[PDB]
Amino acid sequence: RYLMDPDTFTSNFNNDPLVLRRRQTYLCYEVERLDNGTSVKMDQHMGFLCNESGRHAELRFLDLVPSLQLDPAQIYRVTWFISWSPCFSWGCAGEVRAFLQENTHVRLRIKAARIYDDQGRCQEALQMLRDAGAQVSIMTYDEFEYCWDTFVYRQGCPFQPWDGLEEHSQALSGRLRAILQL
Ligand SMILES: [Cl-]
Numbered sequence: 019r020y021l022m023d024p025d026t027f028t029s030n031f032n033n034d035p036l037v038l039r040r041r042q043t044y045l046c047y048e049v050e051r052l053d054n055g056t057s058v059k060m061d062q063h064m065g066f067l068c069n070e071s072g073r074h075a076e077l078r079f080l081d082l083v084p085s086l087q088l089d090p091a092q093i094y095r096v097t098w099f100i101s102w103s104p105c106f107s108w109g110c111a112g113e114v115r116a117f118l119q120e121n122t123h124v125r126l127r128i129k130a131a132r133i134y135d136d137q138g139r140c141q142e143a144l145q146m147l148r149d150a151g152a153q154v155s156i157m158t159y160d161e162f163e164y165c166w167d168t169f170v171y172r173q174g175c176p177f178q179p180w181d182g183l184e185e186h187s188q189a190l191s192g193r194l195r196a197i198l199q200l
Contacts, residue, residue, distance in 0.1 A: 050095045
């Protein structure tokens, strides 16, 4: 798989709530087959995507699913590590819902660096993802470091957290959990 530039990772996955860049979403993905009590991952089922000319990363992932050649008789967990509020863009949650309804052999996990609580459409997109069966949670230090170790061209250098990473993660998590509470 192609590995992400490290400054691109740090700039986009920064979870500082006071920084609200309005351009890009990065989505690191992995597909795991769940079988016999373990998880089986293929390097060819791993990589990252960004928004490209108005087509958002989430939809670009849906676009590549046929190329993954998933066995409909098996169970897969798809994990997204996404740098922006999932399905922020218009109509995105509805397209993910349709995909999940048409592919019941796929379970979607979404780990988000942040969310965008607008007490409106972007907040409702989060509930739509949950209602469609996705498991949505906030990235913690564990996920940021895993993404650094796994998807980034790091040259063996260790993950260096930014100031406030944990404080920001816990605050965002509290809000996401309130939004998705049942
Ligand atoms: Cl969470």
